[PDB]
Design a protein around this ligand. Structure first.
Ligand code: M08
Ligand code: M08
Lengths: 810, 810
């Protein structure tokens, strides 16, 4: 149908059809008489998977022959989403498969909806890892993603009576056609035990053993025939485990629980033993695999020349003392040499500055679980503090601030401090965030080792986040400037010369309307909810958290409702306000915010006076597959975190690429987005970081805003009195109390500017031509935010490798 | 190479080779450079599996079109062993695959050794189910095996310091290429809850739900293109299960533990809740599947015309009240009609008379777990006892003897009584056993309903137990009488005309010697143990149990050793005495017997005076795959249970088919084996059932035998004094105490006759020609013991269906 989806050659279509029928018969053991849509999905998945294998085998043998420096990306989260369409896109098979299935009497888009998301992440951090894998393959890097194969990913969210309910994400129930189990490469991981000092160094003895079984998933690059590997570890009990008899076999579950479930916390540290086990599990198995591969290429001096390890936050921070353990205890290297190798191998990316998100593990937990690692951490700390004392003589408070060991009620290890000490590079994820690291939380470390600190602004892959989810937009762009931009997003700047082109203006607006119609239809079919496709689609999708200020959005919504009720016969620009996202199960306030949103919808959506002028919808079960649907349909992107709290954001970049305008604070990557597009083409409002600092010095008093803003007072009175919960008048008392007395994120302080800015949004929307021209200026300057740009920077500035767009032979 | 293994056509070999390479590439994602023997096994398995699928699909659609009466074989155990060779044999692909792999530079027999046994059974009962499935497919019956997919089958046995150690049988670790998961046919199973009586009957409410997910395995018939199904259920938690959050997901293990592990008890009842859950799990899921299939063909009058359910012992006895529950509570049939349907549908096979093996479930367990079933059982009991009271007026003791409910300290349900009441046919598994049922334990029931009681003598499949494991013997037979006997074992009678044929005598003895050499080589390669291939191979392989009297064998071994030591320079016929089998982990005495055997070996095997004249070996990890190796190598089959204790035995039949002579008591199927071959061609010794009865009336006094047999006294003195355990003098005190004071199985009573009979064995072995002539007379009369004969009898006399040898189109 459309050009960017590739060719549908006679030979290819015929071959795909026959292989489809072969898989339905031999693989699925079905015939067309009893086959269901799900069977058809699997037949298609297996057919497409077959096209990966040749490239996968030859890519890995190419790396063995060429022996390039290998990049190891360690993460506890990989938020992959669906794989079928992405694979077709990267292999140029989409049109061919569409044709093949059409000739078989099937709709491919219907089949695509059957695939479960691989939801092995919480949100932004996990999704960044996924975009990074795509970019590393597209840039021809010898890269490996290493993580945990959770049996249960991020929970499925159901809304019942306006409240969030959780259910297990049983994503493997029907099988996973993309993974290949590699039981032959199973490795042992050790826990507990004790340290024994001998004539020849320390020995870690009397341990409990859990097996790590790898599953490999192919990661195809964009049309370059490169297929890299994501290797995820699954926990297995040894066969002599606990070996009455029956109970001993049943108790194998205890060991295998390590890889059972993803911790559902976004930007929050929960210091549970099971989580610590998960972190060591991935680190220990991965490092053995790295060292094996290095030996199968004695001389560890060349280790850093052949190996780079990237730590995705502090979650895999145990890589540092584990590498030291292996080099010192097992390979018999002297400390100083082992440390040199470790530092040159490891690099650390920090993803947040929120105090409650930082990992600080109780010493007593590490003492019991990982006694040798604690000893190594103590030794690292002593040697590091000796360096600090030499550089800043007599500065005793600096020594306590910089220590890896934190004293107090319970002694803890600061894992961020461990990572900085043991890495040759430390980066933040947006310019403002990286500067905040150097000025505040890691100031002492920056003063000691300035050369270590870098910035690498986040990005998103234009394959999934444009070509896959928005083929209509991809096509109208390709018609004007060709296809090269898909792997060279900076080429979108060429669209600036079309900002006054009447045909292009029409096409951009047409594509948006089509996306909106499609999404409006999706909502009716799957959720029986009714929306006006002519209204402004006002969208805030992201995890529910106080810092992200879904509450500020709620206040604007109520403001709009109240204004309509005050003057019903006055024209307002119609809006559909959509808010979606999951709350961590133990996060009471986030769960209350969800209930508030649905409660507002209950009132607003059923008020006859409002009509189709304002609709409030909570988008249930927000996840990668839903993002791919709603983002292309959005007009307005809500990026409204308190300045200094959102390290980067990546949802923001997705909306910019897909033709939505942004209302946002100068926070995270919003700052660079506004810089790229020009501030005139962005809806910027609210406090800057400096303004937040000034308010903190003075003391934030929410009562002041309540007293001076009559429209705000009305909303608080409505919430308190039970206007949005008539049968439970005091339901939202916790929300009101927090807003009035202990709001860490200063919701009231940005209210007036926000509402004012939103009026400017509505004004522009009344002028479709000028709205679209501003959209074009956003799309055209979105190039910087390709993860290809991000990865090229990591490659050149941290890993010491050169990216390549050269094809491997097919 | 050999004729019975089929043709190796040019087209077939070329096609097998290309499909092998295809699977290695696309399925296994390997190339010849990094592939291991295990990869080669899987490539072969997938290649052979492909040949099943067409036949599997067309067989099942044939049953849908023809709508024949369906046979449902319900068992908690299916001891399948390996599948690769069996599939090749039944599809006539063995020679072709041998050629194909040979041309690829691989040895097929090496690849076959990589496959794990499917060890989903304990021994005889589970293996009978497996032979039955093979025969049902070969006889063209619309048959389905239903059971549980245990994650862990019968434990792997390791011998450490002469003691049995257990380890988990992780048989699914590398995957199972033979099964097809059918998650789309998942069914709910209910537990606990309570019974609510309404205006319209009883309702079972507030239950806990566990999901039953089916996995289908193909069961090919012998060269008839029929492929039946074995459907095994796996336990799954519902997604809202227990839905802090993390613990709730972790607690899913509790539900899924139902299908985790096989209870390792042979002929012993353990009244544990988990086992009861397993029994209901298989019954509830299976019955829903049966009823669905019946409806997809309102009128339950025709149910028994279209459905037969065979209960493999009392383990699936809950089928009776479950069927009543569904018909009465759900389908709204009146009691009397539902009962008529149930009785005509169900039939029960009893497999043992040992009191400790009979299932008697505590009422309190059924009350809590299955409240509605208990109510139904009570109602069945009341109506049944009303019938008994009408037939035998005033006989109050009969009423208490026949009751399904047993009174006492704890009230129990006698599941055997339930099965007799609710079945139209009840059978034993050998003529002597079936007669014992009518005369003793079920005498009261036989008097009430004589027409119900039948015999169906057990059998073994000649495919696995001759063609597969002993191709050399199969071939020399085929050379004389053709190939028809493989599916018509009665044709072996034609070999009687070759008992004086000098060429045949030579060939039979040659095949045995070759098998012995091969097995002697296997022992050296895998266990580094050394044996004389010229010695008499004296073999007792079976589960370790007091009733099977491995101890009697031990006494003979020590007798032989003592006689050699008394007269070292006297010639004796050299023997290799091999004993193997697993002990249930909680069975102390059986574990002690294993230690005794190894302790005897430790003394006998290292005595320089003995030399190569006597060797005692414990065969580690006896299982189906080992049986296939050792049985063809055996000269003497030990079948020495106390008369009246071994219901049938099936190992006995395996040895008879493979050219071993039998030393045995007149117990189980031994009686019919001797009848078929002629008593002159069998080494019969010891008490008959009547002699055991006489001794019991008198009172068994072991001291009498000790006092009157000097050779026996010596052995007991050796055991007691510490001759076989110098460092632990009292190690075998429990064994001596049991033998002297509480031997339920009268080991001493058969000692003299046994030793005498063994002397006659040695005498015959000195004359190779006459030994072989007697062997020929055994092989020639083994036809009755084909499971094809057994299944044909079940079909005609119980199920009301006619077997067919007609081919389905390929
Ligand atoms: O760099 C990727 C993203 O990382 C974060 C940090 C984060 C996280 C998740 C789990 C644990 C700790 C931090 N999720 O999102 C940041 O909050 C977000 O701003 C950033 O875009
Ligand atoms: O019919 C098949 C076989 O059945 C038994 C009975 C049995 C068994 C196994 C588990 C639970 C209860 C009984 N295993 O073997 C009998 O002991 C054996 O004699 C017979 O050949």
């Amino acid at each position: 149908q459309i050009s960017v989806r590739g060719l549908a050659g006679v030979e290819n279509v015929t071959e795909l059809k026959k292989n489809f029928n072969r898989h339905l018969h031999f693989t699925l053991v079905k015939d067309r008489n009893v086959a269901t849509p799900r069977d058809y999905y699997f037949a298609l998945a297996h057919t497409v998977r077959d096209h990966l294998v040749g490239r996968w085998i030859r890519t890995q043998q190419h790396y063995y022959e060429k022996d390039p420096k290998r990049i190891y990306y360690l993460s506890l989260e990989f938020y992959m989403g669906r794989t079928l369409q992405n694979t077709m896109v990267n292999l140029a098979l989409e049109n061919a498969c569409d044709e093949a299935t059409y000739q078989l009497g099937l709709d491919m888009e219907e089949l695509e909806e059957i695939e479960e998301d691989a939801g092995l992440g919480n949100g932004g951090l996990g999704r960044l890892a996924a975009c990074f894998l795509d970019s590393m393959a597209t840039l021809g890097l010898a890269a490996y993603g290493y993580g945990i194969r959770y049996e249960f990913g991020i929970f499925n969210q159901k809304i019942c009576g306006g409240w969030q309910m959780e259910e297990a994400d049983d994503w493997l129930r029907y099988g996973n056609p993309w993974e290949k189990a590699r039981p032959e490469f199973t490795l042992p991981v050790h826990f507990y035990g004790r340290v024994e000092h001998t004539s020849q160094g320390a020995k870690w003895v009397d341990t409990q053993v859990v097996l790590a079984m790898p599953y490999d998933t192919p990661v195809p690059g964009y049309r370059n025939n490169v297929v890299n590997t994501m290797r995820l570890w699954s926990a297995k009990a040894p066969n002599d485990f606990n070996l009455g008899y029956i109970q001993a076999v049943l108790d194998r579950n205890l060991a295998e629980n390590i890889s059972r479930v993803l911790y559902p916390n976004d930007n929050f540290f929960e210091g549970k033993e099971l989580r610590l086990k998960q972190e060591y599990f991935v680190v220990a198995a991965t490092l053995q695999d790295i060292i094996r591969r290095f030996k199968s290429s004695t001389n560890f001096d060349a280790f850093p020349d052949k190996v780079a390890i990237q730590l995705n936050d502090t979650h895999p921070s145990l890589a540092i003392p584990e590498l030291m353990r292996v080099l010192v205890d097992l390979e018999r290297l002297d400390w100083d040499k082992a440390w040199e190798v470790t530092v040159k191998t490891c690099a650390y990316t920090n993803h947040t500055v929120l105090p409650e998100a930082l990992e600080r593990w109780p010493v007593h937990l590490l003492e019991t679980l990982l006694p040798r690692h604690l000893q190594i951490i103590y030794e690292i700390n002593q040697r590091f503090l000796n360096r600090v004392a030499a550089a800043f003589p007599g500065d005793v408070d600096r020594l306590r601030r910089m220590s890896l060991v934190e004293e107090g009620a319970v002694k803890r290890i600061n894992m961020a401090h461990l990572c900085i000490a043991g890495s040759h590079a430390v980066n933040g994820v947006a310019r403002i965030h990286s500067e905040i690291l150097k000025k505040t939380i890691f100031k002492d470390f920056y003063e000691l080792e300035p050369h270590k600190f870098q910035n690498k602004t986040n990005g998103i892959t234009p394959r999934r986040w444009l070509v896959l989810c928005n083929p209509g937009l991809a096509e109208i762009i390709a018609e004007r400037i060709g296809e090269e931009y898909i792997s060279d997003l900076d080429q979108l700047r060429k669209l600036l010369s079309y900002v006054d082109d009447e045909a292009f203006i029409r096409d951009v607006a047409k594509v948006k309307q089509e996306n909106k119609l499609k999404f409006a239809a999706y909502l009716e079919r799957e959720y029986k909810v009714h929306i006006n496709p002519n209204s402004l689609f006002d969208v805030q999708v992201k995890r529910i958290h106080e810092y992200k200020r879904q509450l500020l959005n709620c206040l604007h919504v109520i403001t709009l409702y109240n204004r309509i009720k005050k003057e019903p016969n006055k024209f307002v620009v119609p809006r559909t306000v959509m808010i979606g996202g999951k709350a961590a199960p133990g996060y009471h306030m986030a769960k209350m915010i969800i209930k508030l949103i649905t409660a507002i919808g209950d009132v607003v959506n059923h008020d006859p006076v409002v009509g189709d002028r304002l609709r409030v919808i909570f988008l249930e079960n927000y996840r990668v597959s839903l993002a791919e649907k709603v983002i292309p349909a959005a007009d307005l992107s809500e990026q409204i975190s308190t300045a200094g709290t959102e390290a980067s954001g990546t949802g923001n970049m997705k909306f910019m690429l897909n033709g939505a305008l942004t209302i946002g604070t100068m926070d995270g990557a919003n700052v660079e987005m506004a810089e790229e597009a020009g501030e005139e083409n962005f809806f910027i409002f609210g406090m800057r970081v400096e303004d937040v600092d000034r308010l903190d010095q003075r003391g934030y008093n929410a009562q002041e805003y309540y007293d001076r803003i009559p429209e705000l007072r009305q909303i608080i009175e409505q919430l308190s009195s039970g206007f949005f919960s008539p049968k439970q008048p005091d339901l939202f008392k916790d929300i009101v109390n927090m807003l009035m007395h202990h709001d860490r994120f200063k919701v009231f302080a940005d209210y007036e500017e926000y509402v004012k800015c939103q009026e400017r949004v509505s004004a522009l929307y009344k002028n479709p031509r000028e709205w679209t021209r501003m959209v074009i200026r956003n799309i055209a300057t979105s190039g910087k935010f390709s993860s290809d740009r991000t990865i090229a920077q990591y490659a050149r500035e941290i890993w010491g490798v050169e990216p390549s767009r050269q094809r491997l032979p097919a």
